[PDB]
């Protein structure tokens, strides 16, 4: 996250931290995700497509820091890694960039709700906030494009949803943005998602309920003028989510 503020997991209790174990024993951060039910984390397919082996992955809930144990955190393995069959990536745009991870502790249990571990509500079909609405993103991604390491502490920021018409302008993304995507950015281009934030939540306070409106997917650079973050539009994937579980 470029700009914004540091945060703690009790403020983002649906946030899932996803890591990959390498041969030799080293573990590296991959992407964020969101807990949508006790056994299911939703993320982005591009995070896993090149290494689609479920045994590779470790998922934490209730974790505020990249390389430290948060009190109350829960560690999980991935019982099922479900990638979207029609995934593809153009120069910038990702398509069907959505993935499900069925999580299971070493004892075979799913998430246990607590102050620091909570599910986030899904939207109803095609029900999004209006453009101009402020929404939050959360992640461990880069704080500057020039960084080669991720921050140790979780971050969040607030961005505004941008209309399809605006995002399809020639100086924005033209026809590379589709109706299965949502654009969001800072009007002054000072805060944005970045590399490492993919798969994480775009959450909007929607008609009384904190709602998973988007999944961090793509964007040209980070916090660049006229180059919003682009998010998988969760309200257009509900049949896929419900069907795969």
């Amino acid at each position: 996250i470029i700009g914004g503020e540091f945060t703690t997991i009790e403020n983002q209790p649906w946030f899932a931290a996803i890591y990959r174990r390498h041969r030799g024993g080293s573990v590296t951060y991959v992407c964020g995700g969101s807990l949508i039910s006790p056994c299911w984390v939703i993320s982005a397919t591009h995070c896993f497509i090149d290494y689609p082996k479920k045994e590779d992955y470790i998922v934490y809930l209730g974790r505020s820091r990249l390389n430290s144990n948060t009190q109350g955190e829960m560690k999980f393995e991935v019982e099922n890694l479900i990638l979207h069959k029609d995934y593809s990536a153009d120069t910038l745009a990702h398509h069907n960039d959505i993935a499900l991870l069925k999580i299971r502790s070493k004892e075979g249990r799913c998430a246990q709700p607590s102050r620091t571990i909570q599910t986030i509500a899904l939207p109803s079909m095609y029900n999004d906030p209006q453009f101009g609405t402020s929404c939050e993103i959360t992640g461990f991604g880069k704080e500057q494009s020039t960084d080669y390491l991720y921050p140790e502490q979780l971050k969040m920021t607030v961005v505004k949803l941008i209309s399809h018409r605006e995002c399809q302008q020639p100086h924005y993304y033209g026809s590379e943005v589709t109706t299965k995507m949502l654009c969001a950015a800072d009007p002054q281009w000072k805060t944005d998602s970045c590399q490492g934030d993919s798969g994480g939540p775009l959450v909007c306070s929607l008609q009384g309920r904190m709602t998973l409106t988007g999944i961090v997917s793509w964007g040209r650079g980070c916090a660049l003028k006229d180059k919003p973050g682009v998010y998988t539009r969760v309200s257009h994937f509900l049949p896929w989510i419900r069907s795969h579980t």
Binding site: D50, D197, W218, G221
Partner: peptide
């Protein structure tokens, strides 16, 4: 070009 922020956990060849 290497333009896309969403390039986590890639092989790159």
């Amino acid at each position: 070009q290497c333009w896309d922020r969403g390039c986590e956990n890639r092989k790159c060849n």
